[PDB]
């Protein structure tokens, strides 16, 4: 199954954050879809879900700001939150929720089958003059599938694409048979950026570091890869930076010195 979130990575304060989840592999009319978020370094927070019948449930502390919509034909769920503040900067996940209705009788009461069957009775020895009631159905929920999530930043500062500079290997950056090389992704906003190497064909020995917020207010990070030193004249190495907040993709050839 697949759940893909989409929307703006940057929302100005007091504006309305809006995200859309495109679904495939379960039909939006059978299973129910919910939204979960998590602020950086905080715990998961339930935002709400929409039932197959179109009914919506919201978190009690955020219902005045939330709103979920459905479109079964296009298979798209929508989430909205008004008066977006800096506390709303988080990663927003699109999920599928699964329910499970359990029937039960009130306390002390018993079923007719355990002794007319579906009803709960007050006395099984009589099963006639005893008081009769209906069973109580209560359902529980668990999240089954999670989307990759979308990092949303609530800020007044403006988007800025990244500058990509090469971290080239030299006669001092080597370590015998292996050499380290990378590219520096400088001055971008907001988060995040994604780096690969040779269009994903180079995954062995790759690491991308967490970003850092500079004094200028922009983010920067690095991505490094270790390759055989004997290949620095035969194999070309390209780092593929991706910045969805600005719809920018940069391919930078790393040349040995």
């Amino acid at each position: 199954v697949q759940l893909q979130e989409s929307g703006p990575s940057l929302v100005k304060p007091s504006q309305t954050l809006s995200l859309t989840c495109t679904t495939s592999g379960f039909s939006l009319s059978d299973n129910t879809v919910g939204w979960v978020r998590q602020a950086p370094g905080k715990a998961l927070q339930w935002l709400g879900s929409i039932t197959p019948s179109g009914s919506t449930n919201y978190n009690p502390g955020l219902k005045s700001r939330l709103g979920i919509t459905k479109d079964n034909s296009n298979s798209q769920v929508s989430l909205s939150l008004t008066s977006a503040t800096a506390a709303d900067s988080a990663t927003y996940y699109c999920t599928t929720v699964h329910q499970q209705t359990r029937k039960s009788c009130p306390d002390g009461w018993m079923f007719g089958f355990d002794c007319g069957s579906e009803d709960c009775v007050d006395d099984c020895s009589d099963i006639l003059s005893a008081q009769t009631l209906s069973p109580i159905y209560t359902n529980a929920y668990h999240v089954d599938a999670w989307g990759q999530g979308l990092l949303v930043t609530v800020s007044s500062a403006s988007t800025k694409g990244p500058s990509v500079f090469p971290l080239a290997p030299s006669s001092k950056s080597t370590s015998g048979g292996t050499a380290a090389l990378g590219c520096l992704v400088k001055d971008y906003f907001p988060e995040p950026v994604t780096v690969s190497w040779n269009s994903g064909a180079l995954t062995s020995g790759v690491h991308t570091f967490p970003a850092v917020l500079q004094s200028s207010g922009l983010y920067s990070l690095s991505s490094v890869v270790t390759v055989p030193s004997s290949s620095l004249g035969t194999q070309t190495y390209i780092c593929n930076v991706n910045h969805k907040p600005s719809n920018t993709k940069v391919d930078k050839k790393v040349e040995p010195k």
Binding site: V143, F165, F209, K257
Partner: protein
Amino acid sequence: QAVLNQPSSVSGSLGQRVSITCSGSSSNVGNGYVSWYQLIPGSAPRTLIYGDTSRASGVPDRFSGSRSGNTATLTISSLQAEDEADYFCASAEDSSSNAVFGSGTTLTVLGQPKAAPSVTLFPPSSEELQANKATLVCLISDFYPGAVTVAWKADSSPVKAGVETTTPSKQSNNKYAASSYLSLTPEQWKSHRSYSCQVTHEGSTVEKTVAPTEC
């Protein structure tokens, strides 16, 4: 928006057993039907347990859930290095379709082989210099435990301004990596004769040096 209570962090050695508790009242955990989720950085959350004790698809047998009234427990037996993650419990309050998540627990897997770090110091590229900027990039990788201190030098004199350092984080091979930056102007860069990145790790200090009069 009640927050179920979990310990902020637990620990355990390789191959040993670890338990994570999830405290609640009689109206959300006391009802039962508690689920557990695993969050590894760089990955989407992974549903481990649902309905107190049932495993999800593709969940190994070392992951097991249980409940005892108002406190449910997730137990991970034969501990592995890939089990280092954040774990969250959850339950619906009075079956109102709204669910509450736990405070979260960070798991640490100890007993892993110690490793000394390798350090690489890149001088500012020609492209960055042509843009009237200069950033020294000090990359540290393949070390355990993930505790290092980074110092910058200019002609052996300490430098504390214009330095940014990331907190150590896990690599793909369960070892740690960190990065440090020294943002200078091209005039500051061409000024001194050398700049150094000093990395201290377990009674050892590796120093890498770059000179503007080089490659």
